[PDB]
Amino acid sequence: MKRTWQPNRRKRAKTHGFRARMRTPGGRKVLKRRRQKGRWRLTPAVR
Amino acid sequence: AVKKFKPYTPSRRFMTVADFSEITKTEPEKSLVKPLKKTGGRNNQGRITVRFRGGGHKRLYRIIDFKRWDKVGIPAKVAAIEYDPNRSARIALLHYVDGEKRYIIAPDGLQVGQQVVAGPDAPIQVGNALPLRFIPVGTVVHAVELEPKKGAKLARAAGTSAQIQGREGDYVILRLPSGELRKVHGECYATVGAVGNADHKNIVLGKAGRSRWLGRRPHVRGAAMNPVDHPHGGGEGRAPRGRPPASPWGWQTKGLKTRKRRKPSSRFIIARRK
RNA sequence: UCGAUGUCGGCUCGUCGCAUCCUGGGGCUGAAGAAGGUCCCAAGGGUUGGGCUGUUCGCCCAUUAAAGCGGCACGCGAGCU
RNA sequence: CGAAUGCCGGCAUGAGUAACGAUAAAGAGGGUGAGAAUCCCUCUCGCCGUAAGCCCAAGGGUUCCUACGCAAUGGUCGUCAGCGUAGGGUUAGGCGGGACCUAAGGUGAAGCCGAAAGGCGUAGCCGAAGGGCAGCCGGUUAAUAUUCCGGCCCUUCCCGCAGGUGCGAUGGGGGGACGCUCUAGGCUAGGGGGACCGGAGCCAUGGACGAGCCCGGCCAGAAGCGCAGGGUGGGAGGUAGGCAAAUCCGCCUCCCAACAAGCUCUGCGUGGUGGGGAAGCCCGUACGGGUGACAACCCCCCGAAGCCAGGGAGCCAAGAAAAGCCUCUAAGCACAACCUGCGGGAACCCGUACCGCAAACCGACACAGGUGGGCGGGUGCAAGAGCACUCAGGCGCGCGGGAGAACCCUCGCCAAGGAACUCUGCAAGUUGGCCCCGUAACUUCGGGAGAAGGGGUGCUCCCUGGGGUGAUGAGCCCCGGGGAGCCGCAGUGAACAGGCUCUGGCGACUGUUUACCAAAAACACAGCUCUCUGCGAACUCGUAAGAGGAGGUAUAGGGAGCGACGCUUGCCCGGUGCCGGAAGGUCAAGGGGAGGGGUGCAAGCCCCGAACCGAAGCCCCGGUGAACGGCGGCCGUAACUAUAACGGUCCUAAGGUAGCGAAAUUCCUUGUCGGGUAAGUUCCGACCUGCACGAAAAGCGUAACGACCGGAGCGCUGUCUCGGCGAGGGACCCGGUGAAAUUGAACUGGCCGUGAAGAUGCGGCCUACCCGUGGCAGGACGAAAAGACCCCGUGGAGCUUUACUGCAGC
RNA sequence: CGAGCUAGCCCUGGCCAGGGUGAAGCUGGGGUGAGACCCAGUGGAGGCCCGAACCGGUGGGGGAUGCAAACCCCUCGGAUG
RNA sequence: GUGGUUCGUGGAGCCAUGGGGGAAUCUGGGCGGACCACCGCCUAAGGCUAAGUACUCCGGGUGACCGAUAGCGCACCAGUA
RNA sequence: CGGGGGGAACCUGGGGAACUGAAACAUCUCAGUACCCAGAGGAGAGGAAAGAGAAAUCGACUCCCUGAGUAGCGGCGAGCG
RNA sequence: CGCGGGGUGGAGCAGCCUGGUAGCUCGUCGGGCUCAUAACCCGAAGGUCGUCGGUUCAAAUCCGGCCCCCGCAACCA
RNA sequence: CCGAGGGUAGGGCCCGUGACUGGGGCGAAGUCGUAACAAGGUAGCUGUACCGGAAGGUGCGGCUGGACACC
RNA sequence: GUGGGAGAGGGUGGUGGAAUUCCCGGAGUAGCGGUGAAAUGCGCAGAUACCGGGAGGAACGCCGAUGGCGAAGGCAGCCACCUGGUCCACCCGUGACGCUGAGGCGCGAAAGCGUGGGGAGCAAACCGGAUUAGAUACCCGGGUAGUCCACGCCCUAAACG
Ligand SMILES: [Mg+2]
Ligand SMILES: [Mg+2]
Ligand SMILES: [Mg+2]
Ligand SMILES: [Mg+2]
Ligand SMILES: [Mg+2]
Ligand SMILES: [Mg+2]
Ligand SMILES: [Mg+2]
Ligand SMILES: [Mg+2]
Ligand SMILES: [Mg+2]
Ligand SMILES: [Mg+2]
Ligand SMILES: [Mg+2]
Ligand SMILES: [Mg+2]
Ligand SMILES: [Mg+2]
Ligand SMILES: [Mg+2]
Ligand SMILES: [Mg+2]
Ligand SMILES: [Mg+2]
Ligand SMILES: [Mg+2]
Ligand SMILES: [Mg+2]
Ligand SMILES: [Mg+2]
Ligand SMILES: [Mg+2]
Ligand SMILES: [Mg+2]
Ligand SMILES: [Mg+2]
Ligand SMILES: [Mg+2]
Ligand SMILES: [Mg+2]
Ligand SMILES: [Mg+2]
Ligand SMILES: [Mg+2]
Ligand SMILES: [Mg+2]
Ligand SMILES: [Mg+2]
Ligand SMILES: [Mg+2]
Ligand SMILES: [Mg+2]
Ligand SMILES: [Mg+2]
Ligand SMILES: [Mg+2]
Ligand SMILES: [Mg+2]
Ligand SMILES: [Mg+2]
Ligand SMILES: [Mg+2]
Ligand SMILES: [Mg+2]
Ligand SMILES: [Mg+2]
Ligand SMILES: [Mg+2]
Ligand SMILES: [Mg+2]
Ligand SMILES: [Mg+2]
Ligand SMILES: [Mg+2]
Ligand SMILES: [Mg+2]
Ligand SMILES: [Mg+2]
Ligand SMILES: [Mg+2]
Ligand SMILES: [Mg+2]
Ligand SMILES: [Mg+2]
Ligand SMILES: [Mg+2]
Ligand SMILES: [Mg+2]
Ligand SMILES: [Mg+2]
Ligand SMILES: [Mg+2]
Ligand SMILES: [Mg+2]
Ligand SMILES: [Mg+2]
Ligand SMILES: [Mg+2]
Ligand SMILES: [Mg+2]
Ligand SMILES: [Mg+2]
Ligand SMILES: [Mg+2]
Ligand SMILES: [Mg+2]
Ligand SMILES: [Mg+2]
Ligand SMILES: [Mg+2]
Ligand SMILES: [Mg+2]
Ligand SMILES: [Mg+2]
Ligand SMILES: [Mg+2]
Ligand SMILES: [Mg+2]
Ligand SMILES: [Mg+2]
Ligand SMILES: [Mg+2]
Ligand SMILES: [Mg+2]
Ligand SMILES: [Mg+2]
Ligand SMILES: [Mg+2]
Ligand SMILES: [Mg+2]
Ligand SMILES: [Mg+2]
Ligand SMILES: [Mg+2]
Ligand SMILES: [Mg+2]
Ligand SMILES: [Mg+2]
Ligand SMILES: [Mg+2]
Ligand SMILES: [Mg+2]
Ligand SMILES: [Mg+2]
Ligand SMILES: [Mg+2]
Ligand SMILES: [Mg+2]
Ligand SMILES: [Mg+2]
Ligand SMILES: [Mg+2]
Ligand SMILES: [Mg+2]
Ligand SMILES: [Mg+2]
Ligand SMILES: [Mg+2]
Ligand SMILES: [Mg+2]
Ligand SMILES: [Mg+2]
Ligand SMILES: [Mg+2]
Ligand SMILES: [Mg+2]
Ligand SMILES: [Mg+2]
Ligand SMILES: [Mg+2]
Ligand SMILES: [Mg+2]
Ligand SMILES: [Mg+2]
Ligand SMILES: [Mg+2]
Ligand SMILES: [Mg+2]
Ligand SMILES: [Mg+2]
Ligand SMILES: [Mg+2]
Ligand SMILES: [Mg+2]
Ligand SMILES: [Mg+2]
Ligand SMILES: [Mg+2]
Ligand SMILES: [Mg+2]
Ligand SMILES: [Mg+2]
Ligand SMILES: [Mg+2]
Ligand SMILES: [Mg+2]
Ligand SMILES: [Mg+2]
Ligand SMILES: [Mg+2]
Ligand SMILES: [Mg+2]
Ligand SMILES: [Mg+2]
Ligand SMILES: [Mg+2]
Ligand SMILES: [Mg+2]
Ligand SMILES: [Mg+2]
Ligand SMILES: [Mg+2]
Ligand SMILES: [Mg+2]
Ligand SMILES: [Mg+2]
Ligand SMILES: [Mg+2]
Ligand SMILES: [Mg+2]
Ligand SMILES: [Mg+2]
Ligand SMILES: [Mg+2]
Ligand SMILES: [Mg+2]
Ligand SMILES: [Mg+2]
Ligand SMILES: [Mg+2]
Ligand SMILES: [Mg+2]
Ligand SMILES: [Mg+2]
Ligand SMILES: [Mg+2]
Ligand SMILES: [Mg+2]
Ligand SMILES: [Mg+2]
Ligand SMILES: [Mg+2]
Ligand SMILES: [Mg+2]
Ligand SMILES: [Mg+2]
Ligand SMILES: [Mg+2]
Ligand SMILES: [Mg+2]
Ligand SMILES: [Mg+2]
Ligand SMILES: [Mg+2]
Ligand SMILES: [Mg+2]
Ligand SMILES: [Mg+2]
Ligand SMILES: [Mg+2]
Ligand SMILES: [Mg+2]
Ligand SMILES: [Mg+2]
Ligand SMILES: [Mg+2]
Ligand SMILES: [Mg+2]
Ligand SMILES: [Mg+2]
Ligand SMILES: [Mg+2]
Ligand SMILES: [Mg+2]
Ligand SMILES: [Mg+2]
Ligand SMILES: [Mg+2]
Ligand SMILES: [Mg+2]
Ligand SMILES: [Mg+2]
Ligand SMILES: [Mg+2]
Ligand SMILES: [Mg+2]
Ligand SMILES: [Mg+2]
Ligand SMILES: [Mg+2]
Ligand SMILES: [Mg+2]
Ligand SMILES: [Mg+2]
Ligand SMILES: [Mg+2]
Ligand SMILES: [Mg+2]
Ligand SMILES: [Mg+2]
Ligand SMILES: [Mg+2]
Ligand SMILES: [Mg+2]
Ligand SMILES: [Mg+2]
Ligand SMILES: [Mg+2]
Ligand SMILES: [Mg+2]
Ligand SMILES: [Mg+2]
Ligand SMILES: [Mg+2]
């Protein structure tokens, strides 16, 4: 039956993207935390 | 007057369609005078601020002329009477001698082919438009400005009209289609006649779906809802209203007068429909 | 027994008690015969089909030698419903 | 450390157990190899064929191709692979995106708002599966190809030359530019037939050398033409509108055309030309290469939903924008610039392999699930994308071999009976397509209706009607009509394809719902009523700005009940709510300063503070029932008896009207009577003693409708009496792979006792050699879930209100 | 941090074999003082009918350490709204 | 009308200020806990100002700190799979 | 010419909870804590008396000790201080 | 069993709360008006207050027991 | 072939009959009122509508088959 | 036919004044209404009676008759338009063209009905006051359908001379 992951490469980038985060103070913090933790990807990689 | 159908379906029986024989044009509208529009019921927050709205036919918005006065004195000939989906009434196409085209909301008994003018000058004849001060008392009248040079607000809807009871100072006394009695300023343009398509009130939607075409979505009663949702709901196997009847937001809906008290507008009203 | 002992009825499969419905055997009778009454012995076997109701029960139809009453976590849901 | 259903890890038990993932299906021969049911090749057999074939978009990301590999991955095996290692492989001015347009939305000079972060917002900008734009047919590679090659077309920039013209834009105007259903004429795609054209070969097994059989009979193609279409009037005058300017467009008038007549654009066709080009046979292929050939290359018919395309009609719910494009003028320039034609040159970035209904995507899996667009051939059956078989193509579903128990699942059939089964005909069965005959109550006249019930149904020969395309002719195709016959149990001969009727309840109806235990009588619904709302509307969201409402304006918009339609919807305004009420009463801050206090020598400073004036609200006065709601008790009475039209008396704000009533409501109750049945707690019809119906939380009906729920009959049945047999897939046996919950340890019997009250484990007695396999579930108070019920906890949470106390709002 | 599931709305595209029924209108005849009307033809309406795709999810069986954390078979609802 | 202080409206001053009213310049103004007198303190409505203080990404030194189930989550290519 | 953004913790400022405690709970506590925002730096804040507050006394600010769990504050409760 | 109100001239109601006295309508009886009857007028009569205890000086009145009456409740199971 | 008739299916009409139900007729002396007959004590009757135990009342319109004081 | 007549004959559109009700304004005070008598009601929150203003609906006083017109039902302020019947005069035309009329068609007071409007006065039903034994009546105070208009039905009557 239809499930919860229906990948679409564009939806991913406008949602969890890098300029998405950068646009909002909640999201700038997301990067901040992610970066401070030493995360290898700061933001999902989408092809 | 009101097309009716044989009942070759259920809901074809009581269904009733407007008589369109008034329509002289169809499938325009003058492509120069109209943009598009949209909404959803939702406001700029993405939020439903008016419930039960959406679906319903695509519509082009015919731009129409609620100031007749910017054009004082230039007559115009009535080219067509066509179908405005954005209102109860029908719009009249009029070509001015200016060569300018405008839409007007079409009065009952406005003939395609006749001439209309607007200004203090004007003959008191259907379709013309004047300052209120220059219309003779008793004249029934429609598309009225509430304030000078601000556009036609009052009596625009199919079959509506208004009446001049008298005159007081800079103000004339008007009976509105509500029946309320109001003082409107002398200088306010108004166009003589009633609005027509009067038979509007007699159409019978007749099936559910036809209510959807007008973009009205279903209306669910508090009465059948749970308490989170509405002041009427729960406990069921039905229930009376169990309290004085309320809106979803909780204020009372039979009798409560919601007009603000301290409005300056108040010293310009004399009566009741609200 | 609440860190679970699934609850009515039906179906299936039974098994047991006897305070015996039938059949066998008896005493008494207000037992002429036939047929009953009532009590005694007796658990070997047997104890119908159907209408109504979820019903157990009960009422009813048509038969029967008879159309017994109880126990088994109101026997039986790691057997079904 | 021994316990925490402890934590982390290791290893046991179940156990060689269950499974090994669609019942489309396999067999052999040969090859390779250490090793073969499982890899390769052939032959045979089966499965898909509106697909299980082919193409596109997502998404995936090297899975593609080839060589060498087999440890793991693969539910077995693997010599194979989507797996390991390595090497190769994706080629574009024209296909898709971008150096174009704008849509919702987003963002946002201006501006607005907000403690901060930020929210908004005209224009602009961004944003596409929409608008716009120039490539078609072959061939080639192990692997890409409208990308490379061959062939024939085309577009935009730059520069030049020639000719032409008031040139000129971001500004004006036109256009772009539009719905749904039905649909004309002509074409094309595709398809069938041909006695005609081309072709290896074939005569089998009784017959056939044949107008036999089998295979093929096309594809792209500028200009020109031809056919079918789309679009489209011409000229002058006047002009005050299209925020400047127009010569353009709008409007008025005059003059010829009504017509594609022209001009113009597009479809097909034909086109110089380029290219394909079967069976079969030989060879050799994860595959496809020679020949067949010098291939043929044509007629007829069927025919789109595609094309001409902005076609046509009808209807109402009334059906994007912006650029490209054309025009018009403005500055500015008229050397320029633009326009047309020709010519040279210039033409960037990114995608391009492969999977794609799936073993490569979403589902932890090589998961019976889910996934958008296009093509999707043949025959037969009324049609069809249905169904059966079948082409191209693809597959036999990555454990097998046997056996032929119980039992299970899926399926076939049955004497006599026919619902007796059972909560219930649940389930199965009957019915079944088409044509013709025929068809009731009732009805809102449409319906009810496929009502019901019937008859027909194939093959052959004979005569005949109209249509299409040709010609008004044959031939091909379509729709028929009448007559005589043959065969079987049977002609919708297989497959797909309603069982019907009577009658109640509830909801008018089509719709909607608890994703994943309820599809309903619940919600919605047209429609009725009340109520608010004069427009900077009420209402909603927001702190605001702002927005929705609505670019709407009372024939509108918001709230609330009711719920098609019919006939109706009674009485009560005492309480509550709302509505109205310019008096009155009370009432907060404030105004007022009678009088009183502190202190100071004092001038003073300072603190109280009564009268009285002083909102909303409340009180008070009314109103108001499709506002919250509410609509009696006891006692007597008629010349049989009964019963009470009638009276009496208490209380009320007023005492339940009409309808209906043992009801989706009736406790007593299986009320009583009638009906149906041999028998009826249900069902239907009555009565009325309505525990405890009753009129928009509507009353009573109502044709039609319903996967709703109840009752009854016909038909038919394995539902049953009552079982039997048969099929296949498991189950069993053999080889390969091999889990799980659970598990204090076990050397784990019956009875009668006992015991924390239900003992394998204590007492007595009885019985009992050791160990398994297939089976059934009585027991281990069997597994699972720290019982959801119940109570406890001064535990939570959702909900309500005339609980308390705040807050928003007003 | 989430509307890549699910709910509603907005913008822009697409899909719905085949059959059946035969509304208004139009035309013609009848009718009449003129009508309403009637009949025949044409016509092609509809939250109309049957039924694939598609969308569902009625009843029953199977599954229940599943093929599957909602599946499978049979049947069944809608199918121009 | 509130906030701060130990100050929760209390006899509630002080410091601060959202609203209303609203001065003076040394004989002027603030304070010593309501207010008054006396007696004292101090000079608001402009600004800057080292050091003594806080902390530990980083470098060092030290440990009756751990020794791979410890010690950081990471002794190991870990904020990784 | 300058600004913008980043920095483990530390600092100032704008805003600012609840569980909890009070063995229920409103004032009160937790607590101006957590957290969000803006700013600053290697520190930051503060700072040169319209101060204290009884002595005719001390002299800017900050940090430690003590004063002191004192003065007080408080459903005069819990507790705060 | 449970909670709540109740029982008073023939009928139907007050009175009891807060002790001292029994009241209102109808009916009944006597008289009147009328041919007559009812209506109507004038007069009367009738009750130990469910019952049995108890409290007080005194009980329809306040307390208890039994008998009845109406109402309410009987849920999770 | 047609054919008495039999059988299956669906209609029409007519009779009988049915819990109960509706009103009607009739019945020496039942209960309730007084509608009508005299201006019948509200003139009557009337079609229609609503209401009421009952006769009846009231609305609207109609008919006469109803009308010596007095303002 | 010609010429002339009377008339609330019918349909459409307008329009006038009296009065009633309500609203506003002024003035003014203690009652008003109503009956058989009263009460309910209305009134010091300023009624009634008076003047001024405005809104709205219905019906047309005198003329009016004991009259006119129409087939009937029916028809009454004024004006215009469209239109029916009918009488008189003259003897001009046609030349029995007549009468009646089962069916059919049409009209048809009031009430009633449907969908809209409109709603002042009136007023079934309803409520209250009074009368009565009682009163679901008569009288009085309120009062909704209806009364009016458009369209569409219904088709009755002491539709009577
Ligand atoms: Mg997941
Ligand atoms: Mg995408
Ligand atoms: Mg890295
Ligand atoms: Mg937003
Ligand atoms: Mg609703
Ligand atoms: Mg609900
Ligand atoms: Mg919510
Ligand atoms: Mg609520
Ligand atoms: Mg409620
Ligand atoms: Mg409930
Ligand atoms: Mg209820
Ligand atoms: Mg338990
Ligand atoms: Mg257990
Ligand atoms: Mg015995
Ligand atoms: Mg004997
Ligand atoms: Mg025995
Ligand atoms: Mg029983
Ligand atoms: Mg029996
Ligand atoms: Mg049991
Ligand atoms: Mg079970
Ligand atoms: Mg059971
Ligand atoms: Mg068990
Ligand atoms: Mg221990
Ligand atoms: Mg466990
Ligand atoms: Mg093992
Ligand atoms: Mg085993
Ligand atoms: Mg096995
Ligand atoms: Mg397999
Ligand atoms: Mg070999
Ligand atoms: Mg096929
Ligand atoms: Mg490969
Ligand atoms: Mg291997
Ligand atoms: Mg393997
Ligand atoms: Mg460029
Ligand atoms: Mg753009
Ligand atoms: Mg923004
Ligand atoms: Mg695009
Ligand atoms: Mg392109
Ligand atoms: Mg190609
Ligand atoms: Mg064909
Ligand atoms: Mg031969
Ligand atoms: Mg060609
Ligand atoms: Mg011009
Ligand atoms: Mg201009
Ligand atoms: Mg060609
Ligand atoms: Mg067209
Ligand atoms: Mg055309
Ligand atoms: Mg030009
Ligand atoms: Mg110039
Ligand atoms: Mg490629
Ligand atoms: Mg699939
Ligand atoms: Mg597909
Ligand atoms: Mg594959
Ligand atoms: Mg994958
Ligand atoms: Mg899964
Ligand atoms: Mg597999
Ligand atoms: Mg799959
Ligand atoms: Mg997968
Ligand atoms: Mg699909
Ligand atoms: Mg077929
Ligand atoms: Mg197709
Ligand atoms: Mg098929
Ligand atoms: Mg096997
Ligand atoms: Mg077998
Ligand atoms: Mg049989
Ligand atoms: Mg039979
Ligand atoms: Mg039963
Ligand atoms: Mg069935
Ligand atoms: Mg019938
Ligand atoms: Mg049939
Ligand atoms: Mg035959
Ligand atoms: Mg044959
Ligand atoms: Mg043809
Ligand atoms: Mg079939
Ligand atoms: Mg069928
Ligand atoms: Mg029933
Ligand atoms: Mg329904
Ligand atoms: Mg629902
Ligand atoms: Mg659920
Ligand atoms: Mg569900
Ligand atoms: Mg359903
Ligand atoms: Mg379901
Ligand atoms: Mg707000
Ligand atoms: Mg708008
Ligand atoms: Mg309802
Ligand atoms: Mg209902
Ligand atoms: Mg009511
Ligand atoms: Mg009543
Ligand atoms: Mg009330
Ligand atoms: Mg009141
Ligand atoms: Mg009230
Ligand atoms: Mg006052
Ligand atoms: Mg003193
Ligand atoms: Mg007040
Ligand atoms: Mg009152
Ligand atoms: Mg008697
Ligand atoms: Mg009953
Ligand atoms: Mg019964
Ligand atoms: Mg009941
Ligand atoms: Mg009962
Ligand atoms: Mg019944
Ligand atoms: Mg009810
Ligand atoms: Mg109600
Ligand atoms: Mg009913
Ligand atoms: Mg019904
Ligand atoms: Mg349905
Ligand atoms: Mg249903
Ligand atoms: Mg069987
Ligand atoms: Mg042993
Ligand atoms: Mg024991
Ligand atoms: Mg022992
Ligand atoms: Mg067992
Ligand atoms: Mg057990
Ligand atoms: Mg527990
Ligand atoms: Mg407590
Ligand atoms: Mg609690
Ligand atoms: Mg979505
Ligand atoms: Mg079709
Ligand atoms: Mg069709
Ligand atoms: Mg159709
Ligand atoms: Mg349909
Ligand atoms: Mg789907
Ligand atoms: Mg199902
Ligand atoms: Mg589903
Ligand atoms: Mg099972
Ligand atoms: Mg449907
Ligand atoms: Mg269907
Ligand atoms: Mg269809
Ligand atoms: Mg639609
Ligand atoms: Mg404070
Ligand atoms: Mg306090
Ligand atoms: Mg203080
Ligand atoms: Mg001084
Ligand atoms: Mg001073
Ligand atoms: Mg100060
Ligand atoms: Mg001081
Ligand atoms: Mg002091
Ligand atoms: Mg000082
Ligand atoms: Mg360090
Ligand atoms: Mg470690
Ligand atoms: Mg170690
Ligand atoms: Mg670790
Ligand atoms: Mg702070
Ligand atoms: Mg606490
Ligand atoms: Mg506590
Ligand atoms: Mg608590
Ligand atoms: Mg604090
Ligand atoms: Mg510093
Ligand atoms: Mg504190
Ligand atoms: Mg007497
Ligand atoms: Mg309960
Ligand atoms: Mg009378
Ligand atoms: Mg009388
Ligand atoms: Mg009388
Ligand atoms: Mg009356
Ligand atoms: Mg006249
Ligand atoms: Mg003559
Ligand atoms: Mg003659
Ligand atoms: Mg009439
Ligand atoms: Mg009338
Ligand atoms: Mg009288």
Residue numbers in the entry:
A (entry chain P8): 1 to 47
B (entry chain 11): 2 to 275
Can you list sentences taken from the study reporting this PDB entry?
In this work as in our previous studies, we employed the full Thermus thermophilus 70S ribosome co-crystallized with long synthetic mRNAs and natural tRNAs. We determined six X-ray structures of the 70S ribosome programmed by 30-nucleotide-long mRNAs with AUG codon and E. coli tRNAfMet in the P-site and the A-site occupied by tRNALysSUU bound to its cognate codon AAA or AAG, or near-cognate stop codon UAA and isoleucine codon AUA. To discriminate against pyrimidine-ending codons AAC and AAU encoding asparagine, the E. coli tRNALysUUU contains one of the most complex modifications 5-methylaminomethyl-2-thiouridine (S, mnm5s2U) at the wobble anticodon position 34. Another prominent feature of E. coli tRNALysSUU is N6-threonylcarbamoyladenosine (t6A) at the 37th position of its anticodon loop.
Thus, we determined structures of complexes 3 and 4 where the SUU anticodon of tRNALysSUU formed a U·U mismatch either with the first or the second codon position. As was anticipated, the nucleotides, critical for decoding A1493 and A1492/G530 of 16S rRNA47, stabilized the U·U mismatch at the first and the second codon–anticodon positions via A-minor groove interactions. In both complexes, the interatomic distances between the Watson–Crick edges of opposing uracils exceeded 3.4 Å, implying weak electrostatic interactions. A hypothetical U·U pair possible through a shift in the keto-enol equilibrium would require a typical distance of 3.0–3.1 Å between uracils for hydrogen bonds to occur. However, positions of uracils in both models make this scenario unlikely. To put it simply, the restraints on the sugar-phosphate backbones of the codon–anticodon helix imposed by the decoding centre are strong enough to prevent the uracils to come close enough to interact strongly via hydrogen bonds. In complex 3 with the stop codon UAA and the first U·U mismatch, the codon–anticodon duplex was additionally weakened at the 3′-end where the S34·A(+6) pair was slightly deformed. As a result, only three strong hydrogen bonds were formed between codon and the anticodon compared with the cognate version with six hydrogen bonds. These results demonstrated why tRNALysSUU normally does not read the ochre codon.
